Write a protein that binds this ligand. Structure first.
Ligand code: NA
Ligand code: NA
Ligand code: NA
Lengths: 399, 399, 399, 46, 44
């Protein structure tokens, strides 16, 4: 069309500024109703593609890889995702001591599954698809793909002819989705402009005071996470870090602007295609990654728990701090669903951190974080989306 | 089977008489529980086919036409649909002055979007399909069809092979639906018999009095609409009017008997196929037409607003009358959904006509219209369905 | 893997014993939360496959059989299913006089559709699939299959090419489900172990007393049903009874263990494939059979009505007894849906048997049956699943 | 025997609804006289 | 007066407890919520 990747940067910088201006003069609503819609439409289109592209891609990927292999890749990636997720909150806490974000806050307070695994097996695969539901889709999509392999090896040609057909056909759909992700991308500059403008209009005005301290703490945390873990692990597995960022650029910017791992999945999955990773590998991991792995979100969980505990002048035993890591890692898997999951998890860490949300001051401090949540979420997600790409590139390198 | 198109006329004439008899003797319920079901079953079958036939046909159509072309055809048709819709209410009003339907009615009364466009983009195409949802389907079906074109041009043969497959396969389904629409048609005589019998049993008994005047006004309005606009525009674009009616006959009769533009879409879409219009053209316009364009319904909206305003001896400023047109045109697009949309729109024109529905006399008059709604709706729909066919034949002629 | 069919028997015998032990010591809950889940996962997997495997298989079957033929086979099987169902309750009653199960129970009590056919026609085929809904699926699947035949006879090759494709592709999916049903089967021994263990834990402890008498009466009833009707009708149609049981063995054991006709439908449909019955025949009848025909459940309905009527010392006129048969046969078709349908039907026979459930003693006796319901349901289902297989083998023999 | 659900039956009913107070005023003044009268008569019998 | 003349429109188509209630169960409750009849009863 015109510039194109700049087009996005022009829109992002220009937007986040125009929004910050508009917001300061109390036009946040004016934006919301006039500007924000154009952003939605971007997210809309992306969502749309997810379900076919996840489904179709995985059948094909799973068909054209060995079974034990997924086994490998699965175990690898699951083990990966957890180490990065666990490590990432520890870097959050480390970032949280560096900036003391709960200083003042001159206020205080005293006071006091199997089913989930079962659910991965959809009872209606059609039903599965139809209502969002990424995980049961992943499950069935692999089962289907594997099946197909066995059908094309079958002695009967009349059989392999149907199996080939169905495969091709599914790939048709799969491929055609990658096609559309480029379409949907061309509207990305316009889309991106509206998304960040709206978020700066909403919670720009908020980054003032001790709340800037928490934001800075997160964002340095994320920047540090990328260089200390992702760049280190990329070098350590013989893949060039700076080339990676060239490739992931759209995935990463879309992730940052939408704040939806799910929503950004077709961009992320096109990036892995263009990096020339096999469908067998990314098709299984990236969608598993959208739901299982939430590194960047788990980082900010770490720093926010501190903001609140510092706020009330809570001890926060060093022994306690590691339980912050454990639960918030357990929480990210548990909140696969990204509807302000970040704030939910937070409410959760406090349910077990011992600080009841019902107590006003605990609420008060939570309230503040709520006012800054998108600003955090944008970052947290771009780190989340890099996390999977990285893992997937590493796990692909081992094959 | 037996006669066949007569079979329908025998059933229609025979039915609408038998129903009118049964009704006069208060057997309207007897009919309802014994006869009407047979009519349902006809509507049923038709419904069923819509979703696949709309979706499948459009992917193929959109695949096998130029992109800018849809652009053209879309603009053409959208512009068309509005002129015909706007014009049609003016002919309603013109018909409404001709017959004064609110004479007596010797009673009086005094007293005093973005989101929508967003919604066209489905977030789950599967979900879209599953729950009725024709528009988001139309969107995604075009997106898919276009994508496919680009896939069959791709340098990689392994690609074009999948794309071809998926295309073919979709057309298989598409074609197969046209197949079934002839099946479903063979039961049309029986189906038609029950539908009109039921409607004459229910609101035959009602066409007495000033209510006949509104009915006559509508029906002449519709007859006039066909000759003054559809026949005039057919000649004016070099297509033979009398031949058109030969072709549209089933589409038209089904439309009249069912009262669902949606429901009648497979018949209408088969009629366009048999007229030899390209799938690229009718596949996009006819389903758009089912929801956007409601000429015949908008005509009766015009005449009914008058019945009510005359009823209360309201001024109805000539300046006011044009706002009747504007809102009722804006309303037909808004109530794409045909569950007694006609009566809903009417309630809406009054919400803005200034006559509150809460006032008993305003309600009283409204009530009367309610009692005659099907009798109007049958007509109004047969005009609606001709409207799209015509538009689609004209737009096709331009290509 | 390892043994395999024994693997199932080892797990069944070992489980039903281990469960009975664990239950007697009040660990029923311990089982429920620790063991039962492994059983679920088995049912889960089987369910999943049903919808595609029913749908895909039938399109193909219906495509590749004559229309009038389904006509035949449908009529045959419908007439079959009813005779077997009617007969089976008469054998229940005959079994109920043999064992007097309402003896003591030294307690007494005195005191005092079209729509359904319409529903078979889905309005959204996609919607049909998506939400369970087997029947409207069957309907549309046949309509689709037949359609396709007509498309491959069509003069235009470009047509037959799509029709072939779509067919192939659907068969791909169909075949692939059969593939997965073997997968799902390999986990059957583990699956079966949890299912029966949980049911013995829950209602083992209950088979004590007059309740054993009803259980025995049912179970002899089912054993008798197989030999007196299924074996007799197999010989009488020239098919070897003992070979049948060899083939049906997985179908029958899965049916017994899950208690879901629906759930066991992919095993049952694989058994008919491996018996070499045509897809045209079993594809239409076995799914119809999962919902229409419930012989074994209707047998225990017959014996339970007696338990309760004996309990209160009700007359139970011999004329009354036949109305027990009629309604309980009408009830099985009516409760196609297997969520404890058996107890629902029972509540229904009493709604019309004259004994109101509201009366405590009527309830009391009902309560007892509720406590034994699974133990009965297991049996009743394994007879239900045999019922269709048999019918299907017989109707297949006539072709 | 005239069901209110039938629109025209409703329509006519609607009209009456619009005049209901005008009727109710009168209807009540006659209602209140009714008891007073009855009460005066029954009092006269004692 | 023929009041349904026109109206040029047409249409075809197709206790013990109460006595018990007079006896309030709470006279105070009776008073408190409107309730004229049970009041009359108790008052007598
Ligand atoms: Na992620
Ligand atoms: Na229309
Ligand atoms: Na069955």
């Amino acid at each position: 069309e015109y510039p194109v990747l700049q087009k996005i940067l022009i829109g992002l910088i220009l937007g986040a500024i125009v929004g910050l201006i508009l917001g300061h003069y109390g036009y946040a609503h004016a934006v919301h109703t006039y500007v924000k819609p154009f952003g939605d439409l971007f997210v809309r289109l992306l969502k749309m593609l997810v379900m076919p592209i996840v489904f179709a891609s995985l059948v094909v990927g799973a068909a054209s890889i060995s079974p034990a292999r997924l086994g490998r890749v699965g175990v690898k990636i699951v083990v990966y995702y957890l180490l990065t997720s666990a490590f990432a909150v520890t870097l959050g806490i480390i970032m949280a001591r560096l900036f003391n974000p709960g200083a003042g806050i001159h206020l205080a307070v005293g006071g006091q599954l199997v089913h989930i695994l079962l659910d991965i097996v959809p009872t209606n695969p059609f039903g599965a698809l139809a209502n969002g539901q990424v995980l049961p889709t992943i499950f069935f999509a692999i089962i289907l793909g594997i099946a197909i392999t066995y059908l094309m090896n079958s002695e009967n040609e009349k059989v392999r002819k149907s199996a080939e057909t169905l495969l091709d056909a599914i790939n048709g759909l799969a491929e055609a989705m990658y096609k559309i992700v480029n379409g949907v991308m061309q509207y990305a500059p316009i889309g991106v402009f509206a998304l960040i403008a709206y978020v700066m209009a909403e919670q720009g005005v908020h980054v003032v005071g001790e709340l800037a301290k928490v934001t800075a703490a997160v964002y340095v945390g994320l920047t540090l996470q990328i260089l200390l873990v992702y760049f280190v692990l990329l070098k350590i597995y013989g893949i060039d870090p700076i080339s990676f960022i060239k490739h992931a650029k759209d995935a990463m910017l879309t992730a940052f602007v939408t704040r939806s791992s799910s929503g950004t999945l077709p961009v992320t999955m096109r990036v892995a295609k263009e990096m020339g990773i096999s469908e067998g590998i990314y098709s299984f991991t990236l969608p598993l990654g959208a739901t299982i792995n939430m590194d960047g979100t788990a980082l900010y969980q770490g720093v926010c728990t501190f903001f609140i505990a510092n706020a009330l002048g809570s001890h926060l035993t060093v022994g306690q701090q590691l339980t912050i890591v454990l639960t918030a890692v357990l929480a990210s898997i548990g909140t696969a669903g990204v509807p302000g999951a970040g704030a939910i998890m937070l409410a959760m860490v406090l349910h077990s951190v011992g600080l009841p949300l019902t107590d006003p001051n605990v609420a008060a401090a939570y309230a503040m974080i709520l006012g800054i949540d998108a600003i955090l979420d944008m970052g947290r997600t771009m780190v989340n989306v890099t996390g999977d790409l990285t893992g997937t590139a590493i796990v692909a390198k081992t094959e």
